[model samples]
Target: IVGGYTCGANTVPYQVSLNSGYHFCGGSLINSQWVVSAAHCYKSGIQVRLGEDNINVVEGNEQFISASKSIVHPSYNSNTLNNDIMLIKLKSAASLNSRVASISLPTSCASAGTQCLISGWGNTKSSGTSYPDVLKCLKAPILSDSSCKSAYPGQITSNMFCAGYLEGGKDSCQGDSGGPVVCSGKLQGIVSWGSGCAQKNKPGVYTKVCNYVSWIKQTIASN
Candidate 1:
């Protein structure tokens, strides 16, 4: 989270840390034994750590489980980052508790101008070399479709949406990919990418979660 601060303990209960032997990305627990994240963040030997704010020091109901299977979107494009979402199953169901649980899926797309909560362990600033010890979070308003199109110009597809400040501040950056974007207490977006961390006119791009509801259900059933 750029221009954000460390969140209170268990503030984002469904937040997770995705690791390929080391912390590299974030994810959201959609349900017991199922996590959703950005396909672009995956690697061999993937692991998911739940209920842990600090990946560097695991504690507080933290559970790290090996991935049983990983299913990326069939149409995921690495170059263009289209259909960037993915799902991975945990070895077993996550034992839910007050500090650890699953997040609700979006019932609909977040309307334009909604101030959504985005939390992650990404760099504190656009050019920072460090990751926060605990999870960091901030509220970012969704940009209008026209405004997003104008800033990206030919990059915003139906599967992707943009949220953040048009001015240069408050956004998610590297290592924050695949983190949850919660609006109205629901999961609305996945931190997919951006031109830069909080750049002028360049909102943080996300995988539109509402558009992939069916895909999520199908993946869960078939996987």
Candidate 2:
């Protein structure tokens, strides 16, 4: 995350790391057995680690759970990254606690100018490789749908929205895809894509989570 600081311990308790051999994407624990992430982050061998504050150190509060199944949204479009959301079912239910809990999905959409928290362990640099051992976080305001559409031209869609400064310097970068964009304690967005890590007129784009709350609940119930 550019222009962000290391997250406070247990600050994002619902955050999880999607891993194979290493932390590749971030996710949110939505329930005892389900994790929500970007569809683009899917891979057959992903291991979901909950209650993680650091990727390098073994914090005993961690729960390394294997995924039993992953369901990418049926309408996901790779070319446009529309509906860029996915859900993973853990092999076993997580033990909810202070350091490991679930986050509620947004009941209402986040309006423009709402400041939200974005957290992940993605690259800190826009031009070079730099991943933090600890999670990093930044506060960015939601941009208007029109503003987002203007910034990305035809690439913007109803399922996606942008946030961050127009002048750049703060955003979710590589390896942060699938991370949470929490607004007022609800999971409002999912880190999906952006023009660059942090560039002028190019805010970080995310999957609008509020639009898929029904799909999420239905998916979890049926599968």
Candidate 3:
């Protein structure tokens, strides 16, 4: 979800909203008490809304919950975009049903060239702007470690994964940073960055969720 607003072809996921009315990409419920998303989405006095389509105006079956605290990865670096994951603990546990449900974190990631789903309200084109309300979803293939490393050289670390069309066109653009890159019903990566959005031969980079399983488990346990 981009900026706390759910987006997909016909489905809206979730949106993350900041106090200043600025929105950034965030993920959906991981558990009754936790929501996984990007660390950059964190802001003082932030509120998370689930099952909502529009930010300015609430619609559909929506639930608003204040965050008690944010747990950003201790190693996060804004400059390099390293360890960009975060977890938001809700003031209270959300009431879950069929409409609002949690997604399980992946125990393992697929090999390169595996297909995955990417959804968000990010820019449709590299030079274009981010979508305001509607969410968009697309399918992309995973990139091999060697191929990803070759493309970005030293920039691609073991902590990072890659996805998207090698020929460009369909991809996760700006404002899509920190969303999920799911495969086989599991979240494998968090949308991190790409060279000039969706440039040819450049794939979208993401934080390997599997690589940080220990960190996630420890963080959740500590809280």
Candidate 4:
């Protein structure tokens, strides 16, 4: 995450790193067997690393599990990045602990102006690669749908929302896609895309989680 602070160990327990030899994306542990991420990050042979803070060093609480299956939204559009959510079923149930646990899903939609927490291992720099060794976090406010649409014009869709400042300097960047955007301690959005790391008038775009609650439940129930 750009323009953010390093998170304390075990503080962002629900956060997980998506890895295929190296950290490539971020996700949220929503249950013992399910991880929520962005469809854009989906690929074969992905693994999930839970209870991780510093990726460069080993932490005792870490648990590495292979993905048993992955399900991306049927309506997901790669070009537009609409309905960008995806779920990964773990090969085994996560053993819960102070440093590894699941986060709750949102029951309702977050309102405009709601302050949200976005955390990830994405690049800290706006222009170049500077992926953090440790997880980083930032607090951003959700902008109104109308305002979000104005900023991106034809790109903003109902399945997506914008968070961060119009002035930029803070956002989720590359390697951060599929990370959690929590509001009121619930998973509200999934890091999806943006114009750049943090550009003016181009806030971070996220998959609006509230719109896929039923789809999530249905998918989980069947698979």
Candidate 5:
């Protein structure tokens, strides 16, 4: 099981492992046949696990599947993290069990001021040590377009969304990339970047899933 903090307390959450033995940062089943994660996490010969609280513990049997292929957005630029999104086609379809289920991507976005949950094994604070085996989660309010624009200026594009603690001290950090920023049971965004982890006035940035609905649908359909 991986270790990290949740909404109320510290805890462990299960995560997928790659065949190379390196663990996936984190991922969510989006369809019985697909898994969603950041493009940066893509590597050859990776495996996914579910239903276990700790990575070191073996509870439910691991579901091993090859990554048949990966589809990363062409616009993704690691330097700026633009379009940092991707989808993986598992060699085999996964069973829709409670421990393993798909998350729905939002068709429309929440207006500014909506609180969303962000989860991962990233650092709890900026420049902090990595939580190599824990799953940490926290919540942040969505920023208005104007607010996001003002903070990021020419950097914040329409395809991106912003959220964080304006007062500071509660946000995702390194190792949290490619994880989910869920709001109202919908995947409003995918963790991308931030000025710094949990810092005041520096909101976290994400790829707006809602804005890429067409691209996502087409990619999935064509695949």
Candidate 6:
């Protein structure tokens, strides 16, 4: 499933396109009123769309949700992209239907060898000029934490993990930030950022959701 392709409607119902006017980032619905995304994905005027596979064409089941509050992790570091996670609380809880639903959060971290899937409408190539019109998915194994640390050399924070190819050619690229990296039906990571899209020795880096499980629960409750 490397390189990826367009998936069917409702195949990734929880997947969302975080739009700031246009499709700027990706996200996953964690609950009726909340979306889990990357902290770096938000900016002014951000909104989200669920149950839609293609951005260019409107679908009958699509729901356009507006954010009531955008909460970024308090300790997030933009310089290094550490703790790059965010919760987009919707103004109105999603009208969940067959095509719109929420994804489950991980109870624990994904094992190093676990295979995971990432879906987004990001670019097809690292240096490409355009993003896809429809959602695409790719599968890759979660890289060991130590191996990730070695590649980035002090750049891979404790809150971050890597997933993708060591030899290159499969990954979530720009515009895919904040998407879900699902493993075993649970959200293991967020498409945070990367050195480049699918480059050799530079697998896609993500925000490890398991690292902030407590904080996520507390934040959701406190809101």
Instruction: For candidate 3, give the lDDT of residue 222.
Output: 86
Q: Which ten residues in a row have the lowest lDDT in candidate 3?
A: 1-10
**Count of clashes, each model:** 0, 0, 9, 0, 11, 0
Error of 1 at 109 (Å): 1.2
lDDT of 6 by residue, 1-223 (tens): 2378777777988999888778888899989999989998868677789888878898777889789899999998899999999988998999887678788888888889999989988888766566778888998899999889877997988888999888888888887888999999999999987787888898889899998889989999999
Model 6: CA > 4 A from native: none
Q: Give the per-residue lDDT digits (tens) of candidate 2, residues 172-191.
A: 89988999999999999999
What TM-score does structure 3 among the candidates reach?
Answer: 0.88
The TM-scores, one per candidate, come to: 0.97, 0.98, 0.88, 0.98, 0.85, 0.96
Superposing every Cα of model 2 onto the true structure, what RMSD results?
0.8
lDDT of 4 by residue, 154-206 (tens): 98888999999999898889989999999999999999999888989999999
Superior by lDDT: candidate 1 or candidate 6: 1
lDDT of 1 at 20: 81
Over the stretch 1-223, how does candidate 1's per-residue lDDT look in tens digits?
8899789878799999998877888999999999999999878788899988777875757988999998999999999999999998999998998889899988788899898999999988777577788899988898889998999999999988889888878889998999999999899999999987888888899999999999999889887
Residues 1-223 of candidate 5: C-alpha lDDT, one tens digit per residue: 1122553212212233333475646666677777677777767776765443445655554466777888888787877777778887788887666555677878678878898777775666565565645456676789888888887778887778888866667777776777777789888877788786766677788888887778778888988
lDDT (CA) for every model shown?
0.90, 0.93, 0.72, 0.93, 0.69, 0.86
The digit string of per-residue lDDT tens for model 3 on 1-223 reads 2213234422534333333355566576777878777776667777776765565565667787888988888888888878878888889988777667677777876888888788765666577565666556777888888878888878876778888767777678777766777788787878788887777788788888887778877888988
Candidate 4 segments whose C-alpha is farther than 4 A from its true place? none
Error of 4 at 1 (Å): 0.9
Looking at candidate 3, what is the lDDT of residue 19? 32
Candidates 1 and 2 compared: the better one by lDDT is 2
In model 3, the clashing pairs are: 3-16, 3-24, 4-15, 4-16, 5-15, 6-13, 6-14, 7-135, 8-135
